[PDB]
């Protein structure tokens, strides 16, 4: 009982600090500037799926990310279609908190890339361009 959609390990370390406290800042002390570009790199797999945010205005520096274990989904429930959909919602909801509107989308595979795209358009996170760079082997 008492289920929570988060990471139990991180919840135990809570001490009342606000959000975005451990993230490093810049010289000016601003977490993010109005002039910036983002490109989320999504990687799919059989059981789990990861999607981290990469900032192109900071020499490709990561800001935050999420996984199946950060939404309260474990065991075989991750293989279900809801696991991908829930992860996308968290990214879209968290995007509005930082103050970003337009974020690019990048992925290597096309297997679990349908639930994430649909969830982004249901909150406000739009899509400006789609990038696909499959690193297919060039040798036997």
């Amino acid at each position: 009982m008492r289920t929570l959609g988060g990471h139990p390990r991180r919840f135990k370390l809570m001490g009342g600090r606000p959000e975005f406290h451990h993230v490093d800042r810049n010289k000016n002390g601003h977490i993010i500037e109005p002039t910036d570009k983002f490109q989320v790199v999504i990687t799919t797999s059989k059981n789990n799926v990861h999607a981290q945010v990469v900032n192109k205005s900071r020499a490709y520096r990561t800001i935050f990310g999420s996984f199946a274990g950060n939404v309260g989904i474990r065991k075989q429930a991750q293989q279900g279609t809801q696991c991908a959909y829930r992860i996308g919602q968290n990214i879209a909801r968290k995007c509005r908190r930082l103050g970003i509107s337009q974020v690019e989308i990048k992925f290597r595979r096309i297997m679990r890339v349908n639930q994430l795209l649909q969830a982004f358009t249901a909150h406000g996170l739009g899509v400006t361009a789609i990038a696909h760079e499959p690193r297919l082997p060039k040798c036997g």
Binding site: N28, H30, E33, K37, G99
Partner: protein
């Protein structure tokens, strides 16, 4: 706009981590003839405060492209007057839609240089800049590929 350029020299100071590494920087020549008074002349006010006083009195006559340049230049002579920059916060919020892409880049530099951290205005400016940049595609090691 041109005064700041004259009083600026590009140098390559040593890096913070590795002293062998170099990073290009900017150094501005100090001015010792703009802050002092002029008791001899009738106008006892200095040359710097006089420009600011007239600018705020006739802000409406200036266009958007003509406003960010003048504000960006005042902060480049070490003008630590947060009250001066706090008058334009209400004027800019009501005219955010009429702001060009160049205007965004010419206004953030001013507040940051003077150590004026404003979250209610910087949060709104982020959306405007991204919306304008919604029609330009740029890739890595190739540049801008598709524009509009």
């Amino acid at each position: 706009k041109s005064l700041v350029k004259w009083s600026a020299t590009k140098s390559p100071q040593p890096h913070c981590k590795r002293k062998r590494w170099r990073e290009w920087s900017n150094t501005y020549r100090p001015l010792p003839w703009l802050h002092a008074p002029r008791p001899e002349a009738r106008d006892t006010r200095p040359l710097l405060l006089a420009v600011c006083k007239q600018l705020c009195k006739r802000v409406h006559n200036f266009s958007m492209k003509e406003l960010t340049g003048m504000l960006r230049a005042i902060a480049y002579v070490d003008f630590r007057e947060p009250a001066f920059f706090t008058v334009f916060v209400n004027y800019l919020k009501e005219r955010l839609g009429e702001m060009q892409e160049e205007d965004i880049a010419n206004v953030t530099q001013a507040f940051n240089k003077a150590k004026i951290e404003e979250p209610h205005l910087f949060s709104l400016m982020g959306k405007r800049y991204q919306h304008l940049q919604a029609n330009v595609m740029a890739v890595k090691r190739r540049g801008v590929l598709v524009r509009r």
